[PDB]
């Protein structure tokens, strides 16, 4: 790849610069290069990887939703026929989104997950696997849609099982996993009751463990707890 000639440390340095410049496509490309060096990622480096791709795919998802809405409006009664362009451009954006998701899934499969033995790393990568299958599921309409949804579920569930055994209920990775899996249940799996139950139980179990935390850890955990509360408020 195009980053093969760049030092690992330089790729990481440049990813941090790209983040400061809000150049998330560049950030993602630097981080992909760093992963492809073959060494395990540190905590900081896992965060860089995730931030980069979250921001790239986030932008693509927002664009896809704009275009999908326009396309849906075009298919209503009384809408004038404007030709294939809206579908074509929605497809273009969709294909680019799918490409990014496939790139991330590829990094996780070759070989981040299999080398991840500590709970913090393994849960984090399995959560990411769930997230990128979820993004594929958002745009899926064909023969494989059920298998894509099941791939997301399986990844999230493996992450949940490890997190419950190995991490305290306030751990930010455990909380973030639960937040996202709850959204999977609500938005993808047509399971709003499961979504609500998971968010409520996660919040309550975290609340009960806050007493163990330093001020700084408390700030980190409570930030994500508020996201759980925000979703619960949206859904109830």
């Amino acid at each position: 790849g195009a980053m093969g000639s760049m030092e690992r440390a330089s790729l990481i340095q440049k990813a941090k610069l790209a983040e400061q410049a809000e150049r998330y496509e560049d950030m993602a490309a630097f981080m992909k290069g760093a992963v492809e060096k073959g060494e395990e990622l540190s905590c900081e480096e896992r965060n860089l990887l995730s931030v980069a791709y979250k921001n790239v795919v986030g932008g693509q998802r927002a664009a896809w939703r704009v275009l999908s809405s326009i396309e849906q409006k075009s298919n209503e009664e009384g809408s004038e026929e404007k030709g294939p362009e809206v579908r074509e451009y929605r497809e273009k954006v969709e294909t680019e989104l799918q490409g990014v998701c496939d790139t991330v899934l590829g990094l996780l499969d070759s070989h981040l997950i299999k080398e991840a033995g500590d709970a913090e790393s393994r849960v984090f990568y399995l959560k990411m696997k769930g997230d990128y299958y979820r993004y594929l599921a958002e745009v899926a309409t064909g023969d494989d849609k059920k298998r894509i949804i099941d791939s997301a579920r399986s990844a999230y569930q493996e992450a949940m099982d490890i997190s419950k055994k190995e991490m305290p209920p306030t751990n930010p990775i455990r909380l973030g996993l639960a937040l996202n899996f709850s959204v999977f249940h609500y938005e993808i799996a047509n399971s709003p009751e499961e979504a609500i139950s998971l968010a409520k139980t996660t919040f309550d179990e975290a609340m009960a463990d806050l007493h163990t935390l330093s001020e700084d850890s408390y700030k980190d955990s409570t930030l994500i707890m508020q996201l759980l509360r925000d979703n619960l408020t949206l859904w109830t």
């Binding site: 997230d131 973030g176 937040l179 996202n180 959204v183 609500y186 938005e187 994500i224 996201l227 925000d230 979703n231 949206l234 859904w235």
Partner: peptide
């Protein structure tokens, strides 16, 4: 749209 991290 709901919050994710």
């Amino acid at each position: 749209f709901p919050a994710t991290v």
